């Protein structure tokens, strides 16, 4: 992101925690601006000897090296819970062919058969039909109803 986060004279908005008393734990966000106690003497909110600010600016300039030019980093973490999983893939579909023995796969129900233009009258919320013996015989096409 050099052209964006690097400007003439340098960009110093982005910082980094320079001192910390412990290594961070997974996904741990620490924004504390406590003046770091580098020594044994407490700082009491006064900068000085062994009392240094935790955050330091970044060197982002157009003429900087690649190792120091700005980079925009996005980390995506996938979480599974004891809940409905609401983020999915696109799941593109294929064409619809009738009057031919095809191995279909509609919304969730799969099978093999010939798909023909039926004259059954589903209700608007109903998705597929069942026979007297719990066998699916009619399916509403998800793309065109």
């Amino acid at each position, epitope marked *: 992101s050099n052209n964006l986060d690097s400007k003439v*004279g340098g960009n110093y908005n982005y*910082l980094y925690r*320079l001192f910390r008393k412990s290594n961070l734990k997974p996904f741990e966000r620490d924004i504390s*601006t406590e003046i770091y106690q580098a020594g044994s003497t407490p700082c009491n909110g006064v*900068e000085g000897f062994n009392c*240094y600010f*935790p955050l*330091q*600016s970044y060197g982002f300039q157009p003429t900087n090296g690649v190792g120091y030019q700005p980079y925009r980093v996005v980390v995506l973490s996938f979480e599974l819970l004891h809940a409905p999983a609401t983020v999915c893939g696109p799941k593109k579909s294929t064409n619809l062919v009738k009057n031919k023995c095809v191995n279909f796969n509609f919304n969730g129900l799969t099978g093999t058969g010939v798909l023909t233009e039926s004259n059954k009258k589903f209700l608007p919320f109903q998705q597929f039909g069942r026979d007297i013996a719990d066998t699916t015989d009619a399916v509403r096409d998800p793309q065109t109803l």
Partner: nanobody, 127 residues
């Protein structure tokens, strides 16, 4: 956009006190730090005092420690320069300055560049 409006100061006797202000409008310097500069005739402009805008921790030059006091008010967006214990050598035009850069070392603000500056206020010491 950004303007630094100084007020107060002028002529004061030896041993007297002055207090300077610098109102910033159109910009806030939360993580950055503001500083003061003075230029005696025939000499280069030098660092006076800086204060961290968010934290209030103040850093001073060697020749100004113990006589000058800097403070800032976030609400009023104006920095103060309490200037006690005058010396004749302080005679110079004081400039309130602003920089866009955030620095861990509060001493770095005496050397690091400033992108915003005031109009300059004359300070004269009389005996």
């Amino acid at each position: 956009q950004v303007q630094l409006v100084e007020s107060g100061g002028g002529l004061m006797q030896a041993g007297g006190s002055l207090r300077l202000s610098c109102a910033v409008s159109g910009r806030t310097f939360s993580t950055a730090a503001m500083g003061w500069f003075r230029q005696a005739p025939g000499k280069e402009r030098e660092f006076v005092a800086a204060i961290r805008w968010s934290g209030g921790s103040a850093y001073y030059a060697d020749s100004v420690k113990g006589r000058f006091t800097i403070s800032r008010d976030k609400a009023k967006n104006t920095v103060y320069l309490q200037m006690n214990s005058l010396k004749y050598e302080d005679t110079a035009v004081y400039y309130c300055a602003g920089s866009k850069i955030t620095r861990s070392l509060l001493s770095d603000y005496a050397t690091w560049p400033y992108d915003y500056w005031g109009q300059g206020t004359q300070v004269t010491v009389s005996s």
